[PDB]
Amino acid sequence: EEQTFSWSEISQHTSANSLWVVVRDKTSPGSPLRVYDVTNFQKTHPGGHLILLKYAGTECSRAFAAVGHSKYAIKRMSQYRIGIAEAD
Ligand code: HEM
Ligand SMILES: [Cl-]
């Protein structure tokens, strides 16, 4: 199945010690807000670690799309999924 997270919980994950970001997945039925724990990705993210910290605890879908993240990047995302955010 799936694990749901509340925004009350997501919004706390704002430090480099435990960094979550949320990206809407328009390719999946229901367009879920997928929650990613990118803590262990900070050191290797090609965009750098600072930009991940900027959006920590928030939805970054628009910024993610504006970068034109590649198919390669999107494939690499799945390993960091922890669940989905509660719906709007
Ligand atoms: C798990 C989530 C993410 C993964 C796996 C990821 C992966 C990547 C990859 C592979 C690239 C190289 C370019 C490409 O292949 O398209 C990249 C570049 C970049 N990413 Fe991400 N990214 C993630 C989240 C984010 C988020 C949330 C932002 C916020 C905007 C971001 C900002 C950037 C920027 C700015 C670059 C390009 C840096 C430059 O070329 O100057 N990334 N990312
Ligand atoms: Cl996505």
Author numbering: 12 to 99
The publication says:
5 is an essential electron transfer protein, which is ubiquitously found in living systems and involved in wide variety of biological processes. Tardigrades (also known as water bears), some of which are famous for desiccation resistance, have many proteins unique to them. 5 do not have a C‐terminal transmembrane helix, which anchors the proteins on microsomal or mitochondrial membranes; therefore, they are soluble proteins. 5, are distinguished from others by insertion of amino acid residues which we named tardigrade specific loop (TS loop).
The crystal structure was determined at a resolution of 1.4 Å by a single‐wavelength anomalous dispersion method using a heme iron atom (Fe‐SAD). The electron density map indicates that there are three different conformations of heme. 5 proteins is a presence of a TS loop between β3 and β4. Although the TS loop does not form any secondary structures, the residues on it form a hydrogen bond network with each other and a salt bridge between Asp36 and Arg45. The TS loop shows few interactions with surrounding residues outside the TS loop, implying that it can flexibly move independent of other parts of the protein. One interaction is a hydrogen bond formed by the carbonyl O atom of Ser42 and the side chain of Arg35. The second one is a guanidino group stacking between Arg45 and Arg92. 5, the surface surrounding the heme binding site and a cleft made by the TS loop are positively charged. 5 is thought to interact with proteins having negatively charged surfaces around their redox centers.
